[PDB]
Amino acid sequence: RRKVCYYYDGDVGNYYYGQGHPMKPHRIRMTHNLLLNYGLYRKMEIYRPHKANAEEMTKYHSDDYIKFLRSIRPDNMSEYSKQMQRFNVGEDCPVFDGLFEFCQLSTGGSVASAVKLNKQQTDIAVNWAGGLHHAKKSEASGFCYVNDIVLAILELLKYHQRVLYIDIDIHHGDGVEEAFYTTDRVMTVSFHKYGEYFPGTGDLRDIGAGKGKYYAVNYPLRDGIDDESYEAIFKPVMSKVMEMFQPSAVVLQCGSDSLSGDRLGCFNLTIKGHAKCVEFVKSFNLPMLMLGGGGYTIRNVARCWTYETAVALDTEIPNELPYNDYFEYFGPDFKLHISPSNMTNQNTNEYLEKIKQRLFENLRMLPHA
Amino acid sequence: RRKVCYYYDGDVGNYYYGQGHPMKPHRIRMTHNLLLNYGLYRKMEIYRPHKANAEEMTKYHSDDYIKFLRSIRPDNMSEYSKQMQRFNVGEDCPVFDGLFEFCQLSTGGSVASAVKLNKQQTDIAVNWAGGLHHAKKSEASGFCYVNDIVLAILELLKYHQRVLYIDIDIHHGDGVEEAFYTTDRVMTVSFHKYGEYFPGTGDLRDIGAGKGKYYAVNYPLRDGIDDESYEAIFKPVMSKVMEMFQPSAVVLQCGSDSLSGDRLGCFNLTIKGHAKCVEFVKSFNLPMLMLGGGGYTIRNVARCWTYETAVALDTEIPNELPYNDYFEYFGPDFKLHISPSNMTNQNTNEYLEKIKQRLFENLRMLPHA
Amino acid sequence: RMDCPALPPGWKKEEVIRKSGLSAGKSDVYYFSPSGKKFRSKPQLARYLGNTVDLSSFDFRTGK
Amino acid sequence: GDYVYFENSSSNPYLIRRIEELNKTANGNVEAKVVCFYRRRDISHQLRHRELFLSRQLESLPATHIRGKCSVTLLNETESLKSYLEREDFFFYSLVYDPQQKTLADGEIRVGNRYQADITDLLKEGEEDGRDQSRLETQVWEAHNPLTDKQIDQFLVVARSVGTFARALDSLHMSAAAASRDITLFHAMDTLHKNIYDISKAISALVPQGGPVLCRDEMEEWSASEANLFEEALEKYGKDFTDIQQDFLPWKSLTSIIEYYYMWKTTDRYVQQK
Amino acid sequence: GDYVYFENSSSNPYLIRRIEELNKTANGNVEAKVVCFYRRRDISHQLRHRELFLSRQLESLPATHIRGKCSVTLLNETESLKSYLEREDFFFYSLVYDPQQKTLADGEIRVGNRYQADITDLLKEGEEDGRDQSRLETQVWEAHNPLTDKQIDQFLVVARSVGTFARALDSLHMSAAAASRDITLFHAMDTLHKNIYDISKAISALVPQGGPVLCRDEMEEWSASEANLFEEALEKYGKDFTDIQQDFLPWKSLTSIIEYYYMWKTTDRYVQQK
Ligand SMILES: O=P(O)(O)O[C@H]1[C@H](OP(=O)(O)O)[C@@H](OP(=O)(O)O)[C@H](OP(=O)(O)O)[C@@H](OP(=O)(O)O)[C@H]1OP(=O)(O)O
Ligand SMILES: O=P(O)(O)O[C@H]1[C@H](OP(=O)(O)O)[C@@H](OP(=O)(O)O)[C@H](OP(=O)(O)O)[C@@H](OP(=O)(O)O)[C@H]1OP(=O)(O)O
Ligand SMILES: [K+]
Ligand SMILES: [K+]
Ligand SMILES: [K+]
Ligand SMILES: [K+]
Ligand SMILES: [Zn+2]
Ligand SMILES: [Zn+2]
Known part of the structure; x- marks a missing residue:
C-alpha cells in the first residue's frame, strides 16, 4: 500500500484574506484537525515545510514580481499603487498582513514534496495549502499569488520526462496551462465550467501551441454536473491520456469548488464522486502529488480533502465525524459525506459525447505504436 | 548499607479492639502511610505476609488454646465463657471481630521475616504489627494473644546458636522471658518501669532458672527517664551483653510506649533517644529483626517507627511531615520529632549505677576467654 | 442494645446521646441484664453481679 | 407547424416564423398566426450565420406576406447536413428567447518569453539535483513506529490526563475538555516523535521535573x-x-x-x- | 535541724520528729517546735522497717519529752549503711506526706512444661528447614529497580493525573486531591511492580483499553x-x-x-x- 507524505504548517490556517473575501485559508486547518481525529494523521509521514525563499519562486516568476511581493505591505499600500495595478493586486486579490508568508508556505509544501517524489522516498505526497493555479509569471490572479504548481512541476522535470497535470477545480487551470503552453513534456488536462465564468479560458479549441500543441486538453462544461456524468467522462479521457501521454509523474489538483453547494461553484458533485477521480488516478500507480485549490463552502472543503486523504491511504473512515475543535461547524448532522442537490444537470449526453469525441481525436495526434 | 525487608498487610489497621480500648492497630497503617510519603517505602523490600495457620502457632502454644482462638467469636461469647476465664480473654483483652485474623497477620509477619533472616536474604527485617510480648503459652495477657516473638525466635534457633532478645517497651517482656526462662540459647534483656506497674515481673533479682540462669537480664526503672539517662545505661549494658552472650541474631522489640506523653507509659523519651537504641543495636551488624509492641499516643507511635525505619535504612528524613491521608492527625505542628516534658526524672544517678553494677556482675558469670 | 461479650451471656450495653441542655452532645452508658433490668453505673452493676464476675479492670464506658 | 419566410418590409432578409394556426375569414382572405423566430441582432461569435431563436412573441399577418417555406432544424440535424444539401432555406434553433424580459436552456491565453516558463532540463545520470532537504522540511511524525495504535491511543489519554491535572494546579468536566482539545493532542504526537517513540522517555517529557505541562490554545x-x-x-x-x-x-x-x-x-x- | 525520739505515751516505739526551733521561756522551761515524722501505719510491703515520712504536721512539746537523738538519713545514705553501723537510731525518709489530705514526690514468673517453649534444635549442615516461602509471603515492591527516583516520582504524578481524569468521566481541586490520596499511590507502586518496573507496560495497565482506572478509599x-x-x-x-x-x-x-x-x-x- 502506497506511502503518503503530508505537508502542513500550523500558521496557514491563521492568515486571512480580508473581510467579505471567500478564500479562507482556515479550511486547511479544519482538514488537518479532522485528519488527526480520524486517526489518519497517525498513518502518514508528517512534514513541516520550511519557507520557500524568493530564490526558488523566481525559478518561474519575475525577479521584480516576487521582489514586489516580498516588499508590499498594507503599510506602504498607497505608496506602491503604481505597481499594484501592473500586478493585479486588489478587487478580488487583496493585499493582507502576512501575504508573502502565506505564499512561502504554500510553495514550500509543493516543492519539498516534489523533491520527495524525485528522491523516490514517497509514492504520494499531499499539500492542501498548495494548488493555487490561476497565478501568472508576472501577475497575481484569482486569489493566487504564486503558482506553486508550476514550480513543483519544474522540479519534477529534473527526473521525469513527462509530467501529467490534472485539474478538477471548477475553474480552468490557466496558470498551469499558460506556463507550459509551448512544451510537450507536460500535458495539462482540465475539467471546468465554461461560459460567463472565470477565467474565460479553456474552451474545446484551447489545444496549446508550438511543441505544446495537442498537449493541452480541456473539457468545457455547463452547470449541474452529476457524479455519474462526471465519472462517465473522466475515466474514458484519462485512460486515453495515460495511454497516449504515458507520463512518469502525476500532479492532481483537487479543487473542491467543483463540489455541490459551493459558494462560488455551480457543479453538483459529492465528495464521493469527487474522490472517485483521485482513486482512479492513484490506480495508475505513478508518483503522485495531490494539491488542493479552490473550495468556498469550507465545511465541505474540510470534508472532501479529509476523505481524499483517506483515499491516498486506502483506509476506510466512518461517516460519523470525529469530535474536534471545530466539530460544531458541521451542521446538525455532523457527517462526512454530502449528497447532491435537486439542481438540474444541463450537460446532456449529446453535449458531452460531442466534446469527448473531439478530445479523443486530439489525443490520437500524439505519437504511439 | 544494610538491606531491609518490610512486612505489612493492609487489613491490620482496620481490626479494632473495642470502644474505650487503648491498643489501636490503626497506628501501623499510619506508619505505613508515612513511610510511603517520606519515600522510604520505595527503598526497602515490601512483603505481604500470608496468614499464619494454627499449624505454626501451636509450635509454641497449646493445641487447645489456639483451637479456642480459632473458634471464639462475639457470637458464641456467652457459650464459651467457661474457657474465656481460663484463657484471660476479657477486661483488658477483649474479644473482637477478626481477632484471630489479626493474630495471623502479626505472627505471619514475624515468622516470614525470621525465615528471611535464616535464609540469609536480608540483613534487617521489619514487622511493626508484631512484637506482642505479654502473651503466654496457654493464655492471653496485656493485649497480646499470640506471642509472635517466641515463634519468630524458635525459627531462628534453627540456624542460630544464640539469639539475643532486646525489649525497649516500657512494660517488662515477661512473655518472651517466661517462654525461654530455662534455656541458655536465648538471652532476654529488658528495660522497663517497675513498682505498681504491669506485669509485676522483671525486677533486679529476676535472673532466670536452670540452664537459663544468668541469661535473663532486667533493668527496673522508676518514672521520668531521660534520653540521656537511658542512653547512658543502655549502651554500657548492651556492649557487655554482646561481649559476653556473643549472639548471632538479634531481635529488638521497639515498644513505643516508653516514649514521652504516652497514654499508658510514664517515661520521658524522645523519638531521637528511643531510636538511638535501634541505631546502637544495628551497629553490631547482626541479622536483626525489628518488631513493634506497645505505644498508645498513636500520633507518636507513627512518628517513632517511621523514624526508626529510616534508621534501619540509614537515610535522613526531614522533621517536616509529608502530606498523607492522616496528616491532619499531627497537631498544629506537623513535625516528626517530639521533645521531652518538664516531668521529673526519679532515676537518680546513684540508683542507676547500683543496678548497672549488679547486672555487670550477673553478665560476668557467663563463659568467656 | 448491643451484646457486651465480656459480661455473662445475655448482658447488653447501650450508649445514648444527650439531645439538649448543659451536656447536649455528651453520652450516657447503660447496661441491661438478661431479663431487661437497667443499670447506670459501675458500682451498681458490681453490686448486682457480686462475685460472679470480677469487674476491677472493666471499663464501664467501653464495655471492655 | 411549418416554418415560413415572411416579407421583410425594409428590403432586408426575410423574417422567419413558425405557423401556429392558419385561418381563413368569411370573405376568403387568409391570415396566419405565427410565432416569431428572432435573429441574433434582433435579440436585444458563437452564433452561427443561420441561428434563430424561438420567441414567446406571437403575431398575426395575412398569407400574402409569406414568400417562401423553410426548415428550421434542431442543432444536431443542422450540423449533420451535407455540403451539397446546404441551402438558403436551412436554418436552426437551439435557444428559446423571452422577447419581453431578454432571457435565454441555461479571457485570453498568451504566448511569449514573458508568459511561459523556462523548462528545466532533465538531469544527466551523473548529474545531481543539489537540493538540501533540511532547508526544505522538518519531520514531525514518522508513520512506521515501533508503537501500536493502542499504545498511541493510550498515550493520548495520558497526555490528556496530565493536562487536566496540570490546570488543576492553577470546572472538572471543563478542564478535561480543555485538556482534550487538539493543541494538547498535537503536542502529544510531537512529544512522542521528539522522544523517538519511546513511551517511557516521552512520558518524562510530559512531567519534566515532577511538574506537568499546559498547552492552551488562544481560545482558552x-x-x-x-x-x-x-x-x-x-x-x-x-x-x-x-x-x-x-x-x-x-x-x-x-x-x-x-x-x-x-x-x-x-x-x-x-x-x-x- | 536535728532529729529526736520523743515519748510514746501509749508504751509503744518512740515518735520521731525534726527540731525546727528550740525555745526557752522566761521561767527557764524548755519547749521545742517539731515537724512530725510519721510511721507507715500512722499514715492514714515496699515500706521498709525504718521508713518515716516527713509530714506537714507541726506540734510543740516540752524538752522533757525528748528521750534520745537520732538520724533520719536520705534513702541512698540508708542503703549505703554498713552491717556493723546498723542501729536502732538509724531511720530514713524518701517521701513527704500531707497529713491533712493524705497525699504523697509522685506478678510472678512460672517454670514448667506448661510455661516454657520446647527449644527448636539447630539443623544439621545436611538437614534443611523445609519452609515454603510462597505460603509465607508475596512480594509487593522490589527495592533494587532499573528505575530512578525521578521516574518513579514522575510515574506517581501520572498515576494521579489519570485518576483525576478518570473521575472527570463520571470540584477540580477536589478530584485532584481525591486522586492524590494514598490508595491511588499505593496502587501506583503495585502497578509498577506487577509490570516488572517497565514504565511503558505499566502505563497500559493504568489505561487498559483507552479507559482510565479509579481507586477510591472508603472515605470517597x-x-x-x-x-x-x-x-x-x-x-x-x-x-x-x-x-x-x-x-x-x-x-x-x-x-x-x-x-x-x-x-x-x-x-x-x-x-x-x-
Ligand atoms: O467568518 P468568515 O470567514 O467571514 O465566514 C462567514 C461564515 O461562513 P463559514 O462558516 O463558511 O466560514 C458564516 O457562517 P456561519 O458563521 O453563519 O456558520 C457566514 O454566514 P452564513 O453561513 O449564514 O452565510 C458568513 O456569511 P455572511 O457574511 O454573508 O453572513 C461568512 O462571512 P463572509 O460572507 O464574509 O465570508
Ligand atoms: O478514636 P479512638 O481510637 O477511640 O481514639 C480517640 C482519639 O484518640 P487518637 O486520636 O489518639 O486515636 C481522640 O483523639 P481526637 O480524636 O480528639 O484527636 C481522643 O480524644 P483526646 O485526644 O481529646 O483524648 C479519644 O479519647 P476520649 O475518648 O478520652 O475523648 C480517643 O478515644 P478512646 O479514649 O476511646 O481511645
Ligand atoms: K479545472
Ligand atoms: K502543454
Ligand atoms: K521492656
Ligand atoms: K533465658
Ligand atoms: Zn476554482
Ligand atoms: Zn508496653
Whole structure:
C-alpha cells in the first residue's frame, strides 16, 4: 500500500484574506484537525515545510514580481499603487498582513514534496495549502499569488520526462496551462465550467501551441454536473491520456469548488464522486502529488480533502465525524459525506459525447505504436 | 548499607479492639502511610505476609488454646465463657471481630521475616504489627494473644546458636522471658518501669532458672527517664551483653510506649533517644529483626517507627511531615520529632549505677576467654 | 442494645446521646441484664453481679 | 407547424416564423398566426450565420406576406447536413428567447518569453539535483513506529490526563475538555516523535521535573476581559480583524486574533443562528 | 535541724520528729517546735522497717519529752549503711506526706512444661528447614529497580493525573486531591511492580483499553447518605462500631466502617476540637 507524505504548517490556517473575501485559508486547518481525529494523521509521514525563499519562486516568476511581493505591505499600500495595478493586486486579490508568508508556505509544501517524489522516498505526497493555479509569471490572479504548481512541476522535470497535470477545480487551470503552453513534456488536462465564468479560458479549441500543441486538453462544461456524468467522462479521457501521454509523474489538483453547494461553484458533485477521480488516478500507480485549490463552502472543503486523504491511504473512515475543535461547524448532522442537490444537470449526453469525441481525436495526434 | 525487608498487610489497621480500648492497630497503617510519603517505602523490600495457620502457632502454644482462638467469636461469647476465664480473654483483652485474623497477620509477619533472616536474604527485617510480648503459652495477657516473638525466635534457633532478645517497651517482656526462662540459647534483656506497674515481673533479682540462669537480664526503672539517662545505661549494658552472650541474631522489640506523653507509659523519651537504641543495636551488624509492641499516643507511635525505619535504612528524613491521608492527625505542628516534658526524672544517678553494677556482675558469670 | 461479650451471656450495653441542655452532645452508658433490668453505673452493676464476675479492670464506658 | 419566410418590409432578409394556426375569414382572405423566430441582432461569435431563436412573441399577418417555406432544424440535424444539401432555406434553433424580459436552456491565453516558463532540463545520470532537504522540511511524525495504535491511543489519554491535572494546579468536566482539545493532542504526537517513540522517555517529557505541562490554545488562553473586548469589537466592526486589533486588542498579534475568531465561532453561548 | 525520739505515751516505739526551733521561756522551761515524722501505719510491703515520712504536721512539746537523738538519713545514705553501723537510731525518709489530705514526690514468673517453649534444635549442615516461602509471603515492591527516583516520582504524578481524569468521566481541586490520596499511590507502586518496573507496560495497565482506572478509599466511596448515617450513629452510639453497623449501616462490612472512621476523623467540616 502506497506511502503518503503530508505537508502542513500550523500558521496557514491563521492568515486571512480580508473581510467579505471567500478564500479562507482556515479550511486547511479544519482538514488537518479532522485528519488527526480520524486517526489518519497517525498513518502518514508528517512534514513541516520550511519557507520557500524568493530564490526558488523566481525559478518561474519575475525577479521584480516576487521582489514586489516580498516588499508590499498594507503599510506602504498607497505608496506602491503604481505597481499594484501592473500586478493585479486588489478587487478580488487583496493585499493582507502576512501575504508573502502565506505564499512561502504554500510553495514550500509543493516543492519539498516534489523533491520527495524525485528522491523516490514517497509514492504520494499531499499539500492542501498548495494548488493555487490561476497565478501568472508576472501577475497575481484569482486569489493566487504564486503558482506553486508550476514550480513543483519544474522540479519534477529534473527526473521525469513527462509530467501529467490534472485539474478538477471548477475553474480552468490557466496558470498551469499558460506556463507550459509551448512544451510537450507536460500535458495539462482540465475539467471546468465554461461560459460567463472565470477565467474565460479553456474552451474545446484551447489545444496549446508550438511543441505544446495537442498537449493541452480541456473539457468545457455547463452547470449541474452529476457524479455519474462526471465519472462517465473522466475515466474514458484519462485512460486515453495515460495511454497516449504515458507520463512518469502525476500532479492532481483537487479543487473542491467543483463540489455541490459551493459558494462560488455551480457543479453538483459529492465528495464521493469527487474522490472517485483521485482513486482512479492513484490506480495508475505513478508518483503522485495531490494539491488542493479552490473550495468556498469550507465545511465541505474540510470534508472532501479529509476523505481524499483517506483515499491516498486506502483506509476506510466512518461517516460519523470525529469530535474536534471545530466539530460544531458541521451542521446538525455532523457527517462526512454530502449528497447532491435537486439542481438540474444541463450537460446532456449529446453535449458531452460531442466534446469527448473531439478530445479523443486530439489525443490520437500524439505519437504511439 | 544494610538491606531491609518490610512486612505489612493492609487489613491490620482496620481490626479494632473495642470502644474505650487503648491498643489501636490503626497506628501501623499510619506508619505505613508515612513511610510511603517520606519515600522510604520505595527503598526497602515490601512483603505481604500470608496468614499464619494454627499449624505454626501451636509450635509454641497449646493445641487447645489456639483451637479456642480459632473458634471464639462475639457470637458464641456467652457459650464459651467457661474457657474465656481460663484463657484471660476479657477486661483488658477483649474479644473482637477478626481477632484471630489479626493474630495471623502479626505472627505471619514475624515468622516470614525470621525465615528471611535464616535464609540469609536480608540483613534487617521489619514487622511493626508484631512484637506482642505479654502473651503466654496457654493464655492471653496485656493485649497480646499470640506471642509472635517466641515463634519468630524458635525459627531462628534453627540456624542460630544464640539469639539475643532486646525489649525497649516500657512494660517488662515477661512473655518472651517466661517462654525461654530455662534455656541458655536465648538471652532476654529488658528495660522497663517497675513498682505498681504491669506485669509485676522483671525486677533486679529476676535472673532466670536452670540452664537459663544468668541469661535473663532486667533493668527496673522508676518514672521520668531521660534520653540521656537511658542512653547512658543502655549502651554500657548492651556492649557487655554482646561481649559476653556473643549472639548471632538479634531481635529488638521497639515498644513505643516508653516514649514521652504516652497514654499508658510514664517515661520521658524522645523519638531521637528511643531510636538511638535501634541505631546502637544495628551497629553490631547482626541479622536483626525489628518488631513493634506497645505505644498508645498513636500520633507518636507513627512518628517513632517511621523514624526508626529510616534508621534501619540509614537515610535522613526531614522533621517536616509529608502530606498523607492522616496528616491532619499531627497537631498544629506537623513535625516528626517530639521533645521531652518538664516531668521529673526519679532515676537518680546513684540508683542507676547500683543496678548497672549488679547486672555487670550477673553478665560476668557467663563463659568467656 | 448491643451484646457486651465480656459480661455473662445475655448482658447488653447501650450508649445514648444527650439531645439538649448543659451536656447536649455528651453520652450516657447503660447496661441491661438478661431479663431487661437497667443499670447506670459501675458500682451498681458490681453490686448486682457480686462475685460472679470480677469487674476491677472493666471499663464501664467501653464495655471492655 | 411549418416554418415560413415572411416579407421583410425594409428590403432586408426575410423574417422567419413558425405557423401556429392558419385561418381563413368569411370573405376568403387568409391570415396566419405565427410565432416569431428572432435573429441574433434582433435579440436585444458563437452564433452561427443561420441561428434563430424561438420567441414567446406571437403575431398575426395575412398569407400574402409569406414568400417562401423553410426548415428550421434542431442543432444536431443542422450540423449533420451535407455540403451539397446546404441551402438558403436551412436554418436552426437551439435557444428559446423571452422577447419581453431578454432571457435565454441555461479571457485570453498568451504566448511569449514573458508568459511561459523556462523548462528545466532533465538531469544527466551523473548529474545531481543539489537540493538540501533540511532547508526544505522538518519531520514531525514518522508513520512506521515501533508503537501500536493502542499504545498511541493510550498515550493520548495520558497526555490528556496530565493536562487536566496540570490546570488543576492553577470546572472538572471543563478542564478535561480543555485538556482534550487538539493543541494538547498535537503536542502529544510531537512529544512522542521528539522522544523517538519511546513511551517511557516521552512520558518524562510530559512531567519534566515532577511538574506537568499546559498547552492552551488562544481560545482558552485569553482573559475574560480580552474575550469581552473581542465580542464588542466584532459586534461593532464585524469581521475586520486589523481594526479589531488596532482599536480593541492592540497588544495581541493579528494571527492570534484570527485563530481565536474561528475557535470562538463554535462557542456554546454563541448563537447567531436560530 | 536535728532529729529526736520523743515519748510514746501509749508504751509503744518512740515518735520521731525534726527540731525546727528550740525555745526557752522566761521561767527557764524548755519547749521545742517539731515537724512530725510519721510511721507507715500512722499514715492514714515496699515500706521498709525504718521508713518515716516527713509530714506537714507541726506540734510543740516540752524538752522533757525528748528521750534520745537520732538520724533520719536520705534513702541512698540508708542503703549505703554498713552491717556493723546498723542501729536502732538509724531511720530514713524518701517521701513527704500531707497529713491533712493524705497525699504523697509522685506478678510472678512460672517454670514448667506448661510455661516454657520446647527449644527448636539447630539443623544439621545436611538437614534443611523445609519452609515454603510462597505460603509465607508475596512480594509487593522490589527495592533494587532499573528505575530512578525521578521516574518513579514522575510515574506517581501520572498515576494521579489519570485518576483525576478518570473521575472527570463520571470540584477540580477536589478530584485532584481525591486522586492524590494514598490508595491511588499505593496502587501506583503495585502497578509498577506487577509490570516488572517497565514504565511503558505499566502505563497500559493504568489505561487498559483507552479507559482510565479509579481507586477510591472508603472515605470517597461512601454515598452522601451513608456518610450522613455515620454521623448520626457516632453522635448516638459513640465509637461502638459493631452496633453502629447493626443499627445504622448493616450493609457495610465492619472493617470498612473502621477504615472510614479514621479517614473521617481528619475531615475538615469535622471539628470536635476548639
Ligand atoms: O467568518 P468568515 O470567514 O467571514 O465566514 C462567514 C461564515 O461562513 P463559514 O462558516 O463558511 O466560514 C458564516 O457562517 P456561519 O458563521 O453563519 O456558520 C457566514 O454566514 P452564513 O453561513 O449564514 O452565510 C458568513 O456569511 P455572511 O457574511 O454573508 O453572513 C461568512 O462571512 P463572509 O460572507 O464574509 O465570508
Ligand atoms: O478514636 P479512638 O481510637 O477511640 O481514639 C480517640 C482519639 O484518640 P487518637 O486520636 O489518639 O486515636 C481522640 O483523639 P481526637 O480524636 O480528639 O484527636 C481522643 O480524644 P483526646 O485526644 O481529646 O483524648 C479519644 O479519647 P476520649 O475518648 O478520652 O475523648 C480517643 O478515644 P478512646 O479514649 O476511646 O481511645
Ligand atoms: K479545472
Ligand atoms: K502543454
Ligand atoms: K521492656
Ligand atoms: K533465658
Ligand atoms: Zn476554482
Ligand atoms: Zn508496653
